[PDB]
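Hi Q.,

Before the meeting this afternoon, I wanted you to have the magnesium ion prediction in hand. No need to reply - just skim if you have a minute. The sequence and ligand are here:
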Amino acid sequence: MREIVHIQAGQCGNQIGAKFWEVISDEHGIDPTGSYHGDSDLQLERINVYYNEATGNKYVPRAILVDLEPGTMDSVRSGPFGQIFRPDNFVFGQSGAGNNWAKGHYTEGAELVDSVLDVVRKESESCDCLQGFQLTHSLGGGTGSGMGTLLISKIREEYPDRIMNTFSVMPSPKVSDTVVEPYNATLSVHQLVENTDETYCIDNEALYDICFRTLKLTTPTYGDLNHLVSATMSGVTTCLRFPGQLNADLRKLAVNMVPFPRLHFFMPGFAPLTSRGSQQYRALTVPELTQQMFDSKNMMAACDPRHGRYLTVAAIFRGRMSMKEVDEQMLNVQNKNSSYFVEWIPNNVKTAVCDIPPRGLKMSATFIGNSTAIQELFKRISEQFTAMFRRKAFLHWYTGEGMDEMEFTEAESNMNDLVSEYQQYQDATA
Amino acid sequence: MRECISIHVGQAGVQIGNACWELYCLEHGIQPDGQMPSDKTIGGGDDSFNTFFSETGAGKHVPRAVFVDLEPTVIDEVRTGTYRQLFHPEQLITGKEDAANNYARGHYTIGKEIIDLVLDRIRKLADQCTGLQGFLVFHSFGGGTGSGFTSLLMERLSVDYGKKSKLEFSIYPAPQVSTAVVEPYNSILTTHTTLEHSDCAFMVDNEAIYDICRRNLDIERPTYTNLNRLISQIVSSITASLRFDGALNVDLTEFQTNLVPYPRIHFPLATYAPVISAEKAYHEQLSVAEITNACFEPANQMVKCDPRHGKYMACCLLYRGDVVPKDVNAAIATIKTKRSIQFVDWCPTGFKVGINYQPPTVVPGGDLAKVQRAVCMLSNTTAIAEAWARLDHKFDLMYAKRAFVHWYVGEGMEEGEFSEAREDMAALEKDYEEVGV
Amino acid sequence: MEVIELNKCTSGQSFEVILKPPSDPSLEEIQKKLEAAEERRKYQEAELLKHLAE
Amino acid sequence: MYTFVVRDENSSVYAEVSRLLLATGQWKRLRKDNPRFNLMLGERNRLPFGRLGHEPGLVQLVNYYRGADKLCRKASLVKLIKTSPELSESCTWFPESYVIYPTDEREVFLAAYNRRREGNVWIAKSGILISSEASELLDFIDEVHVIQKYLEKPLLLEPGHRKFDIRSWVLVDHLYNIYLYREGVLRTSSEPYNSATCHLTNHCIQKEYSKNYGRYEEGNEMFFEEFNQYLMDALNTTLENSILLQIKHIIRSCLMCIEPAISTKHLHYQSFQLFGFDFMVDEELKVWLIEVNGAPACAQKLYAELCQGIVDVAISSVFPLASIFIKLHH
Ligand SMILES: Nc1nc2c(ncn2[C@@H]2O[C@H](COP(=O)(O)OP(=O)(O)OP(=O)(O)O)[C@@H](O)[C@H]2O)c(=O)[nH]1
Ligand SMILES: Nc1ncnc2c1ncn2[C@@H]1O[C@H](COP(=O)(O)OP(=O)(O)CP(=O)(O)O)[C@@H](O)[C@H]1O
Ligand SMILES: Nc1nc2c(ncn2[C@@H]2O[C@H](COP(=O)(O)OP(=O)(O)O)[C@@H](O)[C@H]2O)c(=O)[nH]1
Ligand SMILES: [Ca+2]
Ligand SMILES: [Mg+2]
Ligand SMILES: [Mg+2]
Ligand SMILES: [Mg+2]
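Predicted structure with the ligand bound:
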């Protein structure tokens, strides 16, 4: 009965957050009304991790919905699984954040954050043994980015001994809403490096390229992007939601994945890559899963793993398959490409198997890699940042909210430090 | 009659404990009920099996055992399992959140908050002992509880029970089933702290029994259930002398006397044979010579190493089933001429033999086949140091970069304890090399 | 090949064969270590809550 | 793809094997401390045998036999021959030897030495000292050696009246098949053997102290075809009959004696190893064993064929890709 409190902040945060709850509610046999109608006890054995029980055996997501405008949250309440959410956990303002980190972190969001922390507290008090928190948000906007990291800092103050986890969507000009996204992202990363234990880096650059090149979607929507996110999120939380030996809770995952405190930005991967309604008929063989899950084309962060080294890896296979063949294939990857795994962390690849597959598939595999190649992501954001900041472009939006140019300089420097720290261990030898 | 108390710590310790006590009950004819029809002395007894069982006025035979885990799932299965009636609640101790595969978290942070409770529950078993001789402690090297809390428990037992012996059954970490990257850290750390507090420790490498399950039981991908069923047979062989009428290893003190000349070098290598699949339709029963000779094949050892390139300090043969001394000595004579068996100059080249006419009991529906005779060799050979070397190498690789160290420091441990524990292991490897080369 | 100290009973028998002859910390100290580590945790947490206060 | 590591850079033999392996395109060399290897060309000293065979999903092989040093060290070889019943004190192909410590078999050596005086030349090996004076030999040791009977009447090669020793290369695979290389070499002395540089057939001592280095044959090295011919011409016999039968007997006796102690038949890792057996032969065409080398070099013109043989017999046998050897049957 180790509970996780979920928070979703902003448009992006609530969009994927909603899809996340749709997917796993279906995996746990919970319907839009909160009633269980599954055919396996494995579905309810660890249901308490993400759900609260009410009278009539109703299952209520331990989820808090946050935004500075009511737009997306009204869409969620009118969505398929809208009713399932605890109505009082809908915490929203009216002013919006205007894609402005400063508005979310210092002014507009500061006004709303206490209200959110009240709901968090009411949830946490009900917990038998709170593991920690998972946050879904984008880093390119204002609310999810600015207020999201504000929440994280406050939550760490009240719950300093609990694990902080995030699903952070990284901005990309291929799907850009605004030109100030590199600013918001750089300021957010600065917060994440300090105040999170585990961050899944979900790059919109990657999600777009996957949708276009692989899934052959000529005009990718956010729905096409979130089909990939929800599928990844379900996968990385499998070990948390079902019985298992490996990475069964947030802390044990952190201990396995995070050799150094600042280097906790994970590169997720998923196989097989599918589009919505594709409904493919041939299951993949265990060898096929293993080759694809490690393939660059299946990474949700636009980084080439062959350009860096793996510090740690977590692989999760779902569905009825040969655990013997899985072990063999996993051992085969490491032994065939041993150069890409740091030799000074022995046996840094851990594998889990879950009998229950995701809907629409007989076989699937989820990848979680702590690679030094993730620096490519932060480099990219840093280049976009400096291109504008060298001319102090668009800063007036931020100085108008009380921010000083120094705070940008500090944020940039810390991210450039993160990049250099990754490069340090990419060259390190035993 | 002198009582023995079994302490099962962490997931590995508990689940192995479950396997052992299940087996014990079958061997002594005790039911899940806790009833033992053969025991005509009701409510008490001075018998050899009373070393491991106490008796109630109603005639229930209760394991002198305590189960501890900093997380309730595993012990909750015991509370609801087949042998739920066997134990009483105060024996099963559980926390709320585990040590997260972190030695420092199990030793310092969470250990501090439950150590007094456990010792009190242990005290309540000891108060029911007329002549408590010592403790049998089951735990993993790799887990946070198994490593962290055990070392804390071993320190305090030496305080509250200074005169009493303490034996370990330790699970050495193997990647094929390991659940954490830092298990080499935890292993070295708990070995360093526990070394002076343990009189004799039996290491079981999960790698070895994993392959024994693949090779000899034809199990494609062994589970903990497969591993524990086999481990329990080994443990039963080792503890049979404490539970049955005999004259070899009749108390815990005799284990140290017979197998441990030097205190620090208290890690006997266990070897067991035969291991036969219950699915083998046709099987030729193996002779005394054939099973005794198998005790010198690395493929049957609890820890894979090469005793040929080390020296012996002591050896003990523990037979179960149709075995007579004449056939044993005949097998020993033949084996000595064929194999490389060199003792240290200051030890007799000999074997302490123990026979029990009752063949090995096997769990119904288990993977193991019934055999008419089996043996478990306990040999203190310097070759087991190969396992320390492997472990210390993995430790050196990670610690050179201080990888994962922050997780321990954050729990209150000082970075110095790492190098301190590593130094102790460096000396230990040095001791082994002096004695054996 | 000398057998010695042969002991027999209804349950079994034991003996020894020789092929060749030869040729601490107090309870107090423990409580200190657990408490010293506790203070280091409390210090580290205090520095965090100090940093967050800034 | 198979993988291997190199941890002995100063190995001429396995530098060539390493090159040959890569040239197949089916072998990739890793960093020396990468543990996920199929093959290990390990260091000469303190090789970590204890870390081999513990890598799931990897068949691991190494180019050395743990315990083979009992054969390849002077003092250990002596002790092995005297104390092993398979070889026995009554061993007619190994010179009379004794182990002596500076500052032990000193008493036993003198006991037999006094017997000799009433040919009594010996040799002290760790810099070497040949002398009939026991008192001088013992002094040389003090300021661990072996004292061995010096072969006063060696077979002398003509023209030159010069001595020599024979080097045989033996490859033992993971199944303990004993493979004798077709080619051997005679390390010759270029100086006339003087009863009272010309006693030591060492290639280094010859090149440095001999004026006559390389007149009779290339680098004071005679190979088997020439040596065989000479034996037919001069003595009316063959290399096979007069010498090799004894060589094959000695090689088998030594390696079969040690097999139970070093065999990796049922081990979690596997071993092969290249040995170099060094022989003298006397006037009577009687073969003697000098020593065994555990890390032998090869003759320059033989490196290619031998090294390719190691790959075919010892390595490819375990790791199949996509005879120069005489099998000494047991
Ligand atoms: N043989 C055997 N080994 C086990 C078993 N359970 C766990 N292990 C091993 O124990 C090590 C991990 O330690 P655990 O005992 O599971 O962890 P713990 O003692 O509960 O400590 P924490 O969970 O971190 O608080 C790994 O190397 C496992 O392979 C078991 O039932 N049998
Ligand atoms: N017992 C003996 N009787 C006669 N000559 C002997 C002898 N022992 C050694 N020699 C000669 O002295 C030389 C010394 O070589 P030894 O093999 O003893 O040392 P080494 O190990 O330094 C040379 P390598 O390793 O190349 O064979 C021999 O090649 C041989 O020519
Ligand atoms: N994958 C995905 N990304 C989104 C979505 N909505 C916005 N984003 C990304 O998030 C950034 C805009 O942030 P947004 O969530 O709209 O700002 P906020 O609501 O004020 O926190 C841009 O980089 C977008 O690419 C969505 O539904 N899916
Ligand atoms: Ca009784
Ligand atoms: Mg938006
Ligand atoms: Mg546990
Ligand atoms: Mg030599």
